[PDB]
Symmetry: none
Subunit: 184 residues, 2 copies
């Protein structure tokens, strides 16, 4: 399967439906009114490094002052890649907003500091490959029992609030994923 056919699940956090330049449909946020807080504060800002037709993905977010997450049903075994999209639309110094990302309890991004990596009002993506086979989840060399659902968590620490802007899961391997341009 090619790119749009290979996407099994995708969300525009804090926002409405949007189809990007690759043909990927980011669905309206299923956690609206349910957990966390939506914000459209970034809609006043141009977002560097992303395509301008798609900057609405990075201008809307879901955030919270406590740990929160999304649950994802996965129907079939296979190889998959999770892509997480972020932007820092408020701070402009390091160690102001910092948080962990976990997958079924496994820490998969430690101490994410969006400003430190890319600057202010600029796109940043994390790309995480995984496998689901023989009743097991495998990610970053760690293995545990898979029950049918994936839990993606954004963890509250001491430095401001965890957040996410958009996310998708595709069948395949890392060479299949479109990459942001080098200029960060």
């Amino acid at each position: 399967a090619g790119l749009p056919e290979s996407v099994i699940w995708a969300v525009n956090a804090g926002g409405e439906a949007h189809v990007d330049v690759h043909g990927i449909h980011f669905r309206k946020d299923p956690l609206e009114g349910r957990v966390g807080r939506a914000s459209d504060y970034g809609m006043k800002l141009p977002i560097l490094r992303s395509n301008p037709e798609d900057q609405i993905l990075y201008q809307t977010e879901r955030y919270n002052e406590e740990t929160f997450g999304y649950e994802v049903p996965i129907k079939e075994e296979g190889d998959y890649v999770l892509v997480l999209k972020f932007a820092e639309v408020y701070f402009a110094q390091s160690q102001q907003k910092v948080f962990d990302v976990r997958l079924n309890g496994h820490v998969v991004v430690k101490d994410l500091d969006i400003f430190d990596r890319v600057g202010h009002s600029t796109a940043h993506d994390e790309i995480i490959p995984m496998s689901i086979r023989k009743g097991k989840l495998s990610v970053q060399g760690e293995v545990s029992t898979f029950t049918g659902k994936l839990y993606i968590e954004f963890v509250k620490g001491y430095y401001d609030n965890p957040k996410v802007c958009a996310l998708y899961i595709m069948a395949g391997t890392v060479d299949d994923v479109p990459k942001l341009q080098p200029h960060p």
Copy 2:
């Protein structure tokens, strides 16, 4: 670092987010509902000497009948410049509204009289260089211990109320700061 990348902290007092013609993002006021009073009285007036796309910065203010201020975290040592933006949208004579500005207790502007300097409904900026090095703040030839936070105070005297319209801090020196056009 060039101009937008060099701004570490910026506020539109009494107002919402706004990006100016130089690309500087003035954030929504963090003291809303907390300290002092917001006013949009100036939104009825054209502001002279400002770019017209940016006059909303000077049409909105925070003021108070007692002393008040902003606290600013500074993460790294270096040379910096503080820029303070003002307009007098009510009085049209001298010695009607007069106030001091202090930085960590140091008086850095004595007896500011906005009307006396520029007239009615006209932009006026103060430009204050400083250094943070070896555990110390240095400003206007005076030195004191720096703990990690800067306190910017607007002081109540006998002649009406202290106020501010917008403010920002950039890494660099005074030659790097955009200047208002010459005025009588």
